[PDB]
Structures are given as structure tokens and as C-alpha cells.
Design a protein around this ligand. Structure first.
Ligand SMILES: CCCCCCCC/C=C\CCCCCCCC(=O)OC[C@H](COP(=O)(O)OCCN)OC(=O)CCCCCCC/C=C/CCCCCCCC
Ligand SMILES: CCCCCCCC/C=C\CCCCCCCC(=O)OC[C@H](COP(=O)(O)OCCN)OC(=O)CCCCCCC/C=C\CCCCCCCC
Ligand SMILES: CCCCCCCC/C=C\CCCCCCCC(=O)OC[C@H](COP(=O)(O)OCCN)OC(=O)CCCCCCC/C=C\CCCCCCCC
Ligand SMILES: CCCCCCCC/C=C\CCCCCCCC(=O)OC[C@H](COP(=O)(O)OCCN)OC(=O)CCCCCCC/C=C\CCCCCCCC
Lengths: 324, 308, 84, 88, 50
């Protein structure tokens, strides 16, 4: 719909980063489901559960069947591959889903969603109102435009009485931003600390001697360096998702967003009776200013009693014409 | 648009149902994989170690694999995603059962339609300003519509009973799912001991098998258990909200204190339940609707129109 | 000449809208600067891509002689791989 | 990679030296797979392994650069404004 | 509409009859005596239908 004006640049950037991280999750999950395996070769000479590592060259004969090799691979994939290298894509998918839910929670939570829909609808209809152009231009008026302007003025008064008492939208946005940086810190810590465990060479000691004949095996995890790449790329994106989110926190704490002053608008435009608004009205007008400040300007004329008096006088000139 | 009658619990349960459907689809796709179990026979016939020659073909190994998959692997570890799919289909079907009934949907649409007609009517804020030409005629017409709604929906109680039924069904399904899944989650094991009697076909009678995605199915089962636990806690809160206070009656006494009108009566039954629903959505709607419910306010409107 | 009233007021209002849009936009040059930056990034990226891609294209060979020192696991030290 | 061992070697280099008979390496299928994995990881050039991913990254950055001003709110609002007024 | 309903119920009956009758033939263990001894060396085999 038309919620694009309610999403500043930081929200758009975080949404696109979430899309790329979802692409990472899907790609890694497909690879982990389809082609993730280990190629384990037994160590012929062992030195206290450690490989001893010791006329032409001829191949070492291990006497294992293909299914014994498969059993060794499965056991050393389950028991000795690190949990990060196995469940990295699913952890990424979980983190992306939580990030998306946090970013889009207030669009689904009924109390905040109703207020946001009301605000966006009245602001779109106000910005598209011809009375805004007529008033900012400062008697010709179309009749339907006449009671349209009057009804929209009354609707603006209704909305101010209906939204301004509460701050649920601001508090919810604050909590979403706080969670989206706490989770970023936890993700960065546990992902940087455990990314080094995605290795290509894995030495496994699984004690399946009664079924295979060997205790220690040397295994190759083929999809590891790629998992070392994706994770690194993921650690890049999350870092961006952190920094942007941190800026949002700064944007929500550098000044009080529960108070909006129309001082510039009544400084420029004639209607100096335009008051200052508080709470969710103030925060949502700040969000609108993050998209296009002009959207605020054309709204401000609808918040003024002088404009109400002018509209009433001109409408009264119109419908009560001189002939009747 | 029925979204105005979907509270936070309903939306949360719908999203949990979508997540559980995703889990079930992913589990089925994992079940699609051909290589499922890997079995090696038991007691097969610096130190240089040598491999044990089981003396079996690839077809003998595959035969042992399917025999132990059919007759040694637990049925839960093989059919958990399908059970998740069935359970989430039941949850999705029984979560919209209050909405998609024939007689209930018309009442819901009528209530939300005339409530939106209120929320957009000038006579509501006009009536608050009274308390604190064309629009008067539309006010009178909407007032007749409000009386029509009073005589049209207030009689029945299908909506509340139907919502209670679907909530109880959700709760009991959640209880059954949690109980049996928590009982059988211990059967999703990596190492399995298979003892099929195929000594005549292969030569061995005891095999040690590994279920390759047993760890993945265990994680999926725990995640599904967490999702169902959240779903059931949400449904238990829905039951608590349904039965901790009588939703068969709604008192307009808060408006009686706020609005100076005291003729405003206390409606009941489906009227009461849907007022509680829209109060969960937005409490301003009921307060603004109350000034249209009272009939002394209608007499005041008639007098105002008569003088005008 | 002849003028439908709706057409006349729409013309006058769009004239005033032209003036308002002009005094809104003519002050700044953010769009031009952003387009400049996008073109500059897209040309320096093309330079980097053509450089490192022409330099490393010779490394995509079918036959690769690998020497990985896994003699304790395989018995051979050097192998001649084919990259299909 | 399909890696066959060199029977004749000379200081970590392949020496390359009635009916013909096949060379017997006495290697299992899994030893061959391990050799392929190790030589793919260590001796195949990184470009030959990550060319498509680099291309995908470069295209994503190119498309982000081409469509940035249509998504950045400060420029997008002005562009929508100008498009609307010019079309009307 | 009557013809559609009648066809949909008579086909229902036929489907139930033939499906319920033959549902027991979907077995896991199947013995096959296919007489390919000149190509394999054996006449009887014990297959498992996964
Ligand atoms: C209406 C008629 C519909 C029928 C149309 C059929 C469409 C597809 C037909 C072509 C299939 C192409 C493959 C044919 C030969 C099979 C090759 C083969 O054996 O490949 C193996 C591979 C399995 O891999 P394993 O070796 O077990 O891997 C283990 C290591 N991870 O087999 C395959 O699955 C073939 C892959 C091709 C994909 C085609 C679709 C596979 C089925 C998808 C079902 C998913 C549905 C999930 C939803 C269910 C619940 C809502
Ligand atoms: C100019 C800009 C340069 C771009 C990047 C340059 C990278 C050069 C790296 C040089 C280097 O040393 O690389 C080594 C290093 C590891 O090499 P190995 O293969 O272990 O070594 C082989 C042994 N000979 O290679 C790299 O790091 C290359 C990484 C390239 C980036 C890969 C792409 C990252 C993003 C992946 C996108 C995934 C999205 C999936 C989409 C999902 C859609 C459903
Ligand atoms: C910070 C918070 C960190 C969160 C991650 C927790 C990790 C704890 C690790 C515990 C651990 O190592 O346990 C082992 C155990 C493996 O046990 P075995 O193989 O028997 O043991 C081997 C013997 N050495 O590993 C774990 O438990 C790993 C736990 C992490 C689970 C990852 C979560 C993945 C969730 C799966 C759901 C995915 C659904 C995807 C839906 C797809 C829809 C399209
Ligand atoms: C109400 C709560 C229900 C409680 C549990 C319901 C199932 C009862 C289980 C009965 C039982 O144990 O019988 C076993 C019996 C057979 O097991 P075997 O493998 O022979 O057992 C081997 C022994 N280890 O298992 C079952 O019947 C499993 C239960 C049903 C599983 C699947 C149910 C739904 C099947 C239809 C799937 C639909 C998917 C369609 C895909 C669409 C894609 C386009």
C-alpha cells in the first residue's frame, strides 16, 4: 500500500539487507540440505588416538566398503563437525525472521496499525486536497470541494482527538529498535566467536572400530570455505544492520520525538495559530518529515483555527449565494 | 474487511500457523531425500589398523537399509512432518471457523459496516459537541439503521458460542499435540539398533544404523514444540479473556460516566461480544457508537432537526 | 474562448502548483548529486571489474596439476585433476 | 574435479613417463573423492570457484546503484513530485 | 447438475470398490519368480518395495 512514506531511509535499507540475508539463508539451507557431507578417510597408523602421519608410490588399501565409508562419513558429520558449520543457515533464517518480525510488528499489531492507517489515510487525503493549494497560495470554490474541505477539516480534528492522547506507536517503535540492536550485538558476538570453527579439515575420533576397523579418521568438509564466505558476508550485513539501527536509536534519543513544533511553518506561511503537537502525532509527523517535509506543510494548514474560520467564511459565501 | 475483528492473539496464532506450515513443508522436503538410514552389520568378520570386510554387495547394503528403515526406525521419525502438516491444516481451518460461518459472517459485516458508518458520520462528533441540513438527514437515516441493527443482531448468540467452540478446539488440539510430541520426541535418535531377521538374505541378523537427518528432525521437532507451546499459551489467554469476565454482556457504564447521556442502555449477547472485539481493536469505536445507541439522544436529534 | 469551469480552475490550480513545486525543488540539487554519485560508482566499479576479471581469466584451466601432500592418506603426492 | 594420481613423480612434479593395460592405482572410490575435494579446495584457483558469486554480487551492486535514487526517500519524493506535475 | 451429481457419486462408488479391494496389494516384501536364470543365475528373488 502507501506505507512507503512511513518508512524512512533506515527502514528501507534494513528491509533490503534483510532480503539479502534471507537470500543467504535460503542458499545456505539448500546447500546444507542437498550437498553437505564429509569425505572421511581412515588414518592407517594411529598414535594414542592421533594420526601418526607417516618401489613407486602405490595407493593405501583401507579394505572398507562404500557403505562403511558412508557410515564413517555420517558418524563424523554428526558427532565431530561443529554445530555452527551444520546449523549456520537455519540460525541465519531464524535471525532474519526475527528481524523482519521486529521491523514489521507495528504494522500488524492492531493498536498501532489502526493509528498508522488512520494517519496515512488522512495525510494522503490532506496532501491531495485542493484546499491545501488554495490556502498555501495565500472567492472561487467548487461545491463538492467545499464540503470535502470542511469534512476533511473535521476529520483532522477527529484524528487529533483520537491519536494525540497516546504514545503506543512511539513506544513500540522504540522497543523494536532496541530489540533490533540487542539481537545484532548477540548475533555479531556469537557469530564472530564461532566462525573460525568452519574448517575444511576435521579430525574425527568416533569409536566405531567394531563396525569399521579404525578409530580416528581425517575428514574433508567441502562446503566449508563457502560457508566461511557466506558467514563473513552475513557478518558484514548484520554489522550494517547494526550500524543503521544504532543510528535509528540515536535519531530517537538525540531529541524528544514525542513533541513536534510547527514553528518553521507558521514562520513562513501566514497561519501563525498552528499549534504544537505531542505524542504519537508528533512521532508520526517526524517519520513523515524523514520522507518528505512538504507532506508536513500541507498538513499544517488543516491544524489551524484561522484556516477553519477562513474555510467557514468562504464556504458560507459559496452555498448561500446572492441570488437565493 | 474483517481485520478489525482480528485481535493480537488471532494474528499471532495465524503467523504461528504459517511458521508451522513452513516447518512441515521443510520436513517433508527433507523426507524426500533418498539416502535416509545407513546400516552396518554387527560382529562382522603406532598400530596399523585394518578394515573389517563385511563381505556384502551394494544391493545387500541397500536391502538392509530399507529393511531397517521400515522395521526398526520409529514411525515418529519417519512421519513427523506429515503429522505437522495435518496439525497445522487443522489449526488453520479451525482458526477461521468463527469468521467463515454463513450466518455469522453477515452479522459481522453488518456490525463493522454500521460501525464504520458511525466512525465516519458527522453526527457522532456533532453529538459529542451537543453533549459537550443534509448531515441531519443522513444522521436520522443512520439512526434508523442503528435501530435496525439492534433489532437484527442483538437477538442471537451464535458468534460467541462459535468463537468459544473454536478456541476450545484449538486448546485441546494443542494439548494433544504437545503431549504426544513430547512423549515421542525421544524416539528421534541418530544411532538405531536394528534386529531384522534377514540372515538368509544377507548373512547377518544384527545391524547398527544411523539416521542421517535425525539431528535435523530433532531440532525441527523441538522448534515445532516451541511454536505449539506459544500457540497454546496464546489460546489459553484467549480462553482466559473469554471466560474471566462475562462477554455475553457489555456495560456502557463507562460511556455513562463520560457522556452526559444516561439513557444509553447496556446491550447484550452478540452485540456485547462484538463490542468487546472492537474494544480489543480500538476502544474509541464503542464510545462513539454509544451516542448513536441511545434513544433520548434520538429525541434530541429530532428536536434539533425540527428547529432547523 | 470556451472554458469548462472545472477545466479553468484545474488550469489555474495547476499553474499555482507549478509555482509551488518550483519554489520547493529549485532550491536544492540532491537528485543531480545522487545521480552523479551513482554514475561515478558504476564507472569505477566497471574499471575494477574489467581489471581483476581480465587479469584472472587465465586461471580457469581445464587441467590443473594439484600437489596437496595427502600421501599419508592416499599414497600419492601429486595428482592431475580435470576441471570439467 | 576428476583427479588421477601421477604414478611417476620427480620432486613433486609428474614425470609423465603387447596390448595396453590400465594403470592400477589401488585407490578406493572414497580416496578418489577425498583427493578431488582436497585438490578442489587447495589447488583450484579461487576465480574458477567463485566467478558466478562475484558476478552476482557485481550485478546486485550495479542494480542497487541504478535504482538507488528511486528508493532513497529524499530523492524519491522529489522524483515522484516532478513526475506527477509533469504528467498532469 | 443432476447428471453431474449422479456421475460424481457413481464414480465415487466405483473408486471406493476398486481402491479398497486392491489396497492390500501395496506390500513391502514381494517375492518375484521371473525366470531370468540365463541372465542372472537365480530364478527367485525377495524384493523390498521402499
Ligand atoms: C502430476 C505428475 C507429477 C510428476 C512430475 C515429476 C517432476 C520431477 C521429475 C524429474 C525428477 C528428476 C530426477 C530423476 C532422477 C533422480 C536422480 C536422483 O536420484 O537424485 C537424488 C535426489 C535425492 O538425493 P539423495 O541422493 O537422497 O541426496 C542425499 C544427500 N543430500 O533425488 C531427487 O529428489 C531428484 C531431484 C529432482 C527434483 C525434482 C522434485 C523432487 C521432489 C520434490 C518434492 C517436494 C515436495 C515438498 C512438499 C510436500 C508436502 C506439501
Ligand atoms: C574489486 C572487488 C573484489 C571483489 C572480491 C575479491 C576477492 C578476492 C579474494 C582473493 C583470495 O585470496 O581469495 C581466497 C578466498 C578463499 O579461497 P579458497 O577457495 O579457500 O582458496 C583457493 C586456494 N587457491 O576466496 C574468497 O574469499 C573469494 C570470495 C568471493 C566472494 C564470494 C561472494 C560473496 C557473496 C555470495 C552471495 C550469495 C548469495 C546467494 C543468492 C541466493 C539466491 C537464491
Ligand atoms: C547465543 C545463542 C546460541 C544459539 C545456538 C545454541 C548452540 C548450543 C550448542 C549445544 C551443542 O553443541 O549440542 C550438540 C547438538 C548436536 O548433538 P550431537 O550431534 O548428539 O553431539 C555431538 C557430540 N559432540 O547440537 C545442537 O544442539 C545445536 C543447537 C543449535 C540448533 C540450531 C537451530 C536450528 C533450528 C531448526 C529449525 C529450522 C527450520 C527451517 C524452516 C524452513 C522453511 C523454508
Ligand atoms: C489425534 C492425534 C493422533 C495421534 C497419532 C496419529 C498416528 C497414529 C500412529 C499409529 C502407528 O503407530 O502406526 C504405525 C503406522 C505405520 O508405521 P510403520 O512405518 O509400519 O511402523 C514401523 C514401526 N516402527 O504409522 C502411521 O500410520 C503414521 C501416521 C500417519 C502418517 C501420515 C498421515 C497423513 C498422510 C497423508 C500425507 C499428505 C501429504 C500430501 C502431500 C502434498 C504434496 C503436494
Amino acid at each position: 500500500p502507501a506505507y512507503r512514506i512511513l518508512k524512512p531511509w533506515w527502514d528501507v535499507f534494513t528491509d533490503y539487507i534483510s532480503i539479502v540475508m534471507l537470500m543467504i539463508a535460503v542458499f545456505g539451507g539448500t546447500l546444507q540440505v542437498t550437498q553437505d557431507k564429509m569425505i572421511c578417510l581412515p588414518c592407517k597408523w594411529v598414535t594414542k588416538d592421533s594420526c601418526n602421519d607417516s618401489t613407486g608410490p602405490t595407493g593405501i588399501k583401507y579394505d572398507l566398503d562404500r557403505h562403511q565409508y558412508n557410515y564413517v562419513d555420517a558418524v563424523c558429520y554428526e558427532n565431530r563437525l561443529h554445530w555452527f558449520a551444520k546449523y549456520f543457515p537455519y540460525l541465519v533464517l531464524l535471525h532474519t525472521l526475527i528481524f523482519l518480525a521486529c521491523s514489521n510488528f507495528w504494522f500488524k499489531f492492531p493498536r498501532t496499525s489502526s493509528k498508522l492507517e488512520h494517519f496515512v489515510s488522512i495525510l494522503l487525503k490532506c496532501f491531495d486536497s485542493p484546499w491545501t493549494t488554495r490556502a498555501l497560495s495565500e472567492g472561487v470554490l467548487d461545491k463538492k470541494e467545499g464540503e470535502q474541505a470542511k469534512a476533511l477539516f473535521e476529520k483532522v480534528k477527529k484524528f487529533r482527538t483520537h491519536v494525540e492522547e497516546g504514545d503506543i506507536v512511539y513506544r513500540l517503535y522504540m522497543r523494536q529498535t532496541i530489540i533490533k540492536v540487542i539481537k545484532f550485538a548477540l548475533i555479531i558476538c556469537y557469530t564472530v566467536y564461532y566462525v573460525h570453527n568452519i574448517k575444511f579439515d576435521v579430525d574425527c575420533t568416533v569409536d566405531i572400530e567394531s563396525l569399521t576397523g579404525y578409530r580416528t579418521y581425517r575428514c574433508a568438509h567441502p562446503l566449508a570455505t563457502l560457508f566461511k564466505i557466506l558467514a563473513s558476508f552475513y557478518i558484514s550485513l548484520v554489522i550494517f544492520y547494526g550500524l543503521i539501527c544504532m543510528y535509528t536509536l540515536w535519531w530517537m534519543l538525540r531529541r524528544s520525538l514525542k513533541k513536534y513544533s510547527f514553528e518553521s511553518i507558521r514562520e513562513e506561511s501566514s497561519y501563525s495559530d498552528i499549534p504544537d503537537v505531542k505524542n504519537d502525532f508528533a512521532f508520526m509527523l517526524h517519520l513523515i518529515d524523514q520522507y518528505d517535509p512538504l507532506y508536513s506543510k500541507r498538513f499544517a494548514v488543516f491544524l489551524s483555527e484561522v484556516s477553519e474560520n477562513k474555510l467557514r467564511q468562504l464556504n458560507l459565501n459559496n452555498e448561500w449565494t446572492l441570488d437565493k | 474487511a474483517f481485520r478489525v475483528l482480528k485481535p493480537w492473539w488471532d494474528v499471532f496464532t495465524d503467523y504461528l500457523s504459517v511458521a508451522m506450515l513452513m516447518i512441515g513443508v521443510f520436513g517433508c522436503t527433507l523426507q524426500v531425500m533418498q539416502d535416509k538410514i545407513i546400516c552396518l552389520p554387527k560382529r562382522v568378520q603406532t598400530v596399523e589398523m585394518k578394515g573389517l570386510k563385511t563381505d556384502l554387495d551394494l544391493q545387500q547394503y541397500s536391502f538392509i537399509n530399507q529393511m531397517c528403515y521400515e522395521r526398526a526406525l520409529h514411525w515418529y521419525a519417519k512421519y513427523f512432518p506429515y503429522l505437522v502438516l495435518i496439525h497445522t491444516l487443522v489449526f488453520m481451518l479451525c482458526s477461521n471457523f468463527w469468521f467463515k460461518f454463513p450466518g455469522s459472517s453477515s452479522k459481522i459485516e453488518h456490525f463493522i459496516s454500521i460501525l464504520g458508518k458511525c466512525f465516519d458520520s458527522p453526527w457522532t462528533t456533532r453529538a459529542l459537541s451537543e453533549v459537550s441540513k443534509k448531515e441531519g438527514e443522513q444522521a436520522k437515516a443512520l439512526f434508523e439503521k442503528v435501530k435496525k441493527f439492534r433489532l437484527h443482531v442483538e437477538e442471537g448468540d451464535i458468534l460467541y458460542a462459535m468463537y468459544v467452540r473454536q478456541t476450545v478446539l484449538k486448546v485441546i488440539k494443542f494439548l494433544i499435540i504437545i503431549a504426544y510430541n513430547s512423549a515421542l520426541v525421544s524416539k528421534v535418535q541418530f544411532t538405531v539398533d536394528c534386529n531384522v531377521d534377514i540372515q538368509d538374505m544377507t548373512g547377518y541378523k544384527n545391524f547398527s544404523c544411523n539416521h542421517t537427518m535425525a539431528h535435523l528432525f530433532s531440532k525441527l521437532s523441538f522448534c515445532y514444540l516451541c511454536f505449539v507451546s506459544i500457540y497454546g499459551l496464546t489460546c489459553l489467554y484467549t480462553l482466559y479473556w473469554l471466560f474471566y469476565r462475562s462477554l455475553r454482556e457489555y456495560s456502557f457504564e463507562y460511556v455513562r460516566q463520560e457522556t452526559g447521556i444516561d439513557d444509553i442502555p447496556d446491550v447484550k449477547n452478540d452485540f456485547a461480544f462484538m463490542l468487546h472485539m472492537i474494544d480489543q481493536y480500538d476502544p474509541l469505536y464503542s464510545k462513539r457508537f454509544a451516542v448513536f445507541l441511545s434513544e433520548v439522544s434520538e429525541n434530541k436529534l429530532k428536536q434539533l432537526n425540527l428547529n432547523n
